[PDB]
């Protein structure tokens, strides 16, 4: 399971609880 749709199963900003929230299709914590 990924955790979001703005970061694939290989992001280096979602290895400590998906922080991507408040923006769909894009984020600002892994941008
Ligand atoms: Cd994301
Ligand atoms: Cd991420
Ligand atoms: Cd995530
Ligand atoms: Cd993010």
Largest distance between two CA atoms of the chain: 21
Q: Which residues surround ligand 1, an ion (CB under 5 A)?
A: 4, 6-7, 20, 27
Question: Domain ranges in the chain?
Answer: 1-31
What's the CA gap between 19 and 6, in Å, rounded? 11
Contact of 27 with 8, CB cutoff 8 Å: no
Question: Is the separation of the CB atoms in 4 and 29 below 8 Å?
Answer: no
Known binder of ligand: residue 20? yes
Is 5 annotated for ligand binding?
Answer: no
Q: How far is the CA of 22 from the centre of ligand 3 (A)?
A: 12
Number of Cβ atoms within 10 Å of the Cβ of 7: 20
Residue 11 assigned to a binding site:
yes
Q: What is the DSSP letter of 25?
A: S
DSSP characters over 1-31: --S-SSS-TT-SS-SSS----S-SS--SS--
Sign of the CA dihedral with 5 first, then 27, 3, and 10 last? positive
Q: Which ligand places an atom closest to the C-alpha of 2?
A: 3
């Amino acid at each position: 399971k990924s955790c979001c749709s703005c970061c694939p199963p290989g992001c280096a900003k979602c290895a400590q609880g998906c922080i991507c929230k408040g923006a769909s299709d894009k984020c600002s914590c892994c941008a």
